[PDB]
């Protein structure tokens, strides 16, 4: 149990960090530029395949595996229909991430996208029948400022050789921020509404996710893809991004299961701070004054959020 939590967070933290800069890299240095829509779609395919394997391991046998697929996919059309909503919303979110990093510096993206933290807290209280004390709300905005400081970097020195539309990038992030809170909390509500396996829920969602993301690939880029090919512009780094997005999505679902969507934001900030401090001590990595102050705010916000809060009996007695 202890090791699984350590492996989930160090995987989450290395993947999320590497993901943004690697994605930015692939969008700015290529001559032949791949279709972002296709990478989002292939990510859904990989997550489905890994989730299927994890369900086989969890069920423990081919017969129990087949039985679970039959009851929970073939036999649960309403669950498939419900989870099509976050699949639609996530298809937009993940495509907006590529659009934004095509047009903005990674650090500009990272700071702005942290607005998902208060968004996700609001979605949580509105959709999950939960409350936050006034002190907890303070801690949520404190966390947001802390991670903003943690992520604040000087702009990259490399000159960009492709056209950029930063305003389009900011519009993309604004959409992604709204998507992040709504789809994550929607998935959480479905997951915690029954004892159905996490891996069943992921399979249920990725099935519609593959359909929606491929349809979006067709509608956005179908004509140019018939000309250039679906995998036009793919490189080792494009696959690296897809792999990172796949692992990151799977571990996101795990963190939501064992904690919640608000704790996800606190735990990711703690992991970024601790892994950065580890790299200072192990490798002499240099940090900024912004990071140092943000780290303290992250620490205080975690402390404040966990402090002990009658006015929420419906919350604690039934979920
Ligand atoms: C694999 C992805 C899941 C797609 C649905 C698989 C359905 C199968 O189930 C057959 C069993 C009958 O006993
Ligand atoms: C951005 C915030 C989006 C808030 C949505 C709140 C919501 O969807 O509440 C639904 C309610 O639980 C029943 O329909
Ligand atoms: C609060 C919400 C405020 C943001 C609302 C709209 C942003 C508009 C810009 C977002 C653009 C993403 C969708 C889009 O139009 O994609 C263009 C693409 O280049 C061709 O398909
Ligand atoms: C914050 C919301 C910012 C919304 C910006 C919308 C935008 O700038 O869109 C550019 C347009 O797509 C040009 O091609
Ligand atoms: C393998 C095939 C299923 C894969 C994706 C389905 C995508 C989600 C679409 C599911 C729609 C089911 C539906 O609309 O029927 C619901 C009705 O309430 C009946 O219970
Ligand atoms: C169906 C919805 C799936 C979401 C597909 C969004 C496609 C998109 O917005 O892509 C713009 C393009 O990448 C600009 O270069
Ligand atoms: C925790 C308080 C410890 C304060 C240590 C801060 C170190 C620091 O901010 O280093 C910046 C860098 O050396 C140059 O920008
Ligand atoms: C909840 C959930 C999210 N995801 C993915 O995890 C990511 C969540 O990103 P954010 O924490 O920035 O919203 C998205 O890329 C989404 O597609 C997933 O793959 N499976 C899930 N069950």
Stated as kind and residue range, the H or E segment containing 39 is helix 36-59
Q: State how far the Cα of 282 lies from the Cα of 153, in Å rounded to an integer.
A: 22
Work out which ligand 3 atom sits closest to the CA atom of 168: 9
Burial class (CB in 10 A: 0-12, 13-18, 19+), 22: buried
Please give the distance, rounded to the nearest whole angstrom, from the Cα atom of residue 266 to the centre of ligand 7: 22
In a domain, 285, yes or no: yes
Q: State how far the Cα of 145 lies from the Cα of 114, in Å rounded to an integer.
A: 9
Q: State how far the Cα of 119 lies from the Cα of 243, in Å rounded to an integer.
A: 27
Question: 132 in helix, strand or coil?
Answer: coil
Work out which ligand 2 atom sits closest to the CA atom of 181: 1
Q: What is the stated resolution of the deposited model, in angstroms?
A: 1.8
Q: State how far the Cα of 141 lies from the Cα of 145, in Å rounded to an integer.
A: 6
| Cα four-point dihedral sign 49, 50, 55, 60 | positive
In a domain, 41, yes or no: yes
| Cα four-point dihedral sign 94, 232, 209, 211 | positive
In a domain, 249, yes or no: yes
**Residue 121 token pair:** 């807290």
**Residue 310 token pair:** 């009658």
> Does the C-beta of 202 come closer than 6 Å to ligand 8?
yes
**Residue 53 token pair:** 């394997």
> Does the C-beta of 167 come closer than 6 Å to ligand 4?
yes
In a domain, 171, yes or no: yes
- Phi, then psi, of 103 in degrees rounded to 5: -125, -10
Q: How far is CA 186 from CA 32, 89, 92, 110, 180, in A?
A: 37, 10, 15, 23, 10
Which ligand is closest to the CA of 112, given by its number?
A: 4
Q: After which residues is the chain broken (C to N over 2.5 A)?
A: 309
In a domain, 1, yes or no: no
At a CB cut-off of 8 Å and minimum separation 6, what does 296 contact?
146
**Could you tell me if 143 and 117 are in contact, meaning their C-beta atoms sit under 8 angstroms apart?**
yes
193 is an annotated ligand-binding site residue:
no
Domain extent at residue 42: 7-309
Q: State how far the Cα of 217 lies from the Cα of 210, in Å rounded to an integer.
A: 10
Question: 163 in helix, strand or coil?
Answer: coil
In a domain, 318, yes or no: no
Q: State how far the Cα of 102 lies from the Cα of 80, in Å rounded to an integer.
A: 32
Task: Return the number of other C-beta atoms located less than 10 Å from residue 16's C-beta.
Answer: 19
- Counting the structural domains of the chain, the total is 1
In a domain, 40, yes or no: yes
Burial class (CB in 10 A: 0-12, 13-18, 19+), 257: middle
Closest residue by CA, ligand 2 atom 11: 127
**Could you tell me if 100 and 23 are in contact, meaning their C-beta atoms sit under 8 angstroms apart?**
no
Q: What is the DSSP letter of 72?
A: I
Nearest to 301 by CA among 263, 274, 253, 272: 263
Task: Give the N- to C-terminal CA distance of the chain in Å, as an integer.
Answer: 23
Stated as kind and residue range, the H or E segment containing 241 is helix 236-258
Q: State how far the Cα of 157 lies from the Cα of 163, in Å rounded to an integer.
A: 16
305 is an annotated ligand-binding site residue:
no
| Cα four-point dihedral sign 263, 79, 97, 120 | negative
Stated as kind and residue range, the H or E segment containing 300 is helix 289-305
Work out which ligand 8 atom sits closest to the CA atom of 198: 22
Q: Best mutation site among 96, 120, 121, 184 for ligand 8, i.e. most ligand atoms within 8 A of its Cβ?
A: 184
In a domain, 215, yes or no: yes
**Could you tell me if 180 and 119 are in contact, meaning their C-beta atoms sit under 8 angstroms apart?**
yes
């Amino acid at each position: 149990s202890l090791f699984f939590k350590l492996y989930c967070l160090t995987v989450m933290t290395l993947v999320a960090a590497a993901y943004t800069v690697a994605l930015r890299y692939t969008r700015t240095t290529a001559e032949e530029l791949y279709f972002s829509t296709t990478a989002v779609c292939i990510t859904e395919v990989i997550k489905l395949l890994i989730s299927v394997g994890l369900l086989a391991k969890e069920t423990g046998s081919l017969g129990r595996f087949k039985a679970s697929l039959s009851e929970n996919v073939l036999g649960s059309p309403k669950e498939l229909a419900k989870l099509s909503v976050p699949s639609l919303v996530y298809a937009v979110q993940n495509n907006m991430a590529f659009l934004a990093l095509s047009n903005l510096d990674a650090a500009v993206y990272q700071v702005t996208y942290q607005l998902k933290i208060p968004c996700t807290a609001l979605c949580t209280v509105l959709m999950l029948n939960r409350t936050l004390s006034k002190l907890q709300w303070i801690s949520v905005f404190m966390l947001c400022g802390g991670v903003t400081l943690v992520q604040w970097k000087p702009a990259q020195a490399t000159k960009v050789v492709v056209a950029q539309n930063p305003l389009l990038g900011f519009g993309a992030i604004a959409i992604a921020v709204l998507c992040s809170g709504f789809a994550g909390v929607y998935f959480e509500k479905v997951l915690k509404s029954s004892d159905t396996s996490l891996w069943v829920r992921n399979i249920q969602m990725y099935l519609s996710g593959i359909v929606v993301t491929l349809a979006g690939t067709y509608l956005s880029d179908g004509a140019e893809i018939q000309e250039k090919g679906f995998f036009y512009g793919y490189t080792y780094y494009v696959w690296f991004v897809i792999f990172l997005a796949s692992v990151g999505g799977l571990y996101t679902s795990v963190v939501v299961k064992y904690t919640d969507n608000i704790m996800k934001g606190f735990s990711a900030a703690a992991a970024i701070v601790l892994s950065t401090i580890a790299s200072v001590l192990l490798f002499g990595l240099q940090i900024t004054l912004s990071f140092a102050l943000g780290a303290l705010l992250v620490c205080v916000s975690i402390y404040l959020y966990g402090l002990p809060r009658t006015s929420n009996s419906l919350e604690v007695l039934f979920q």
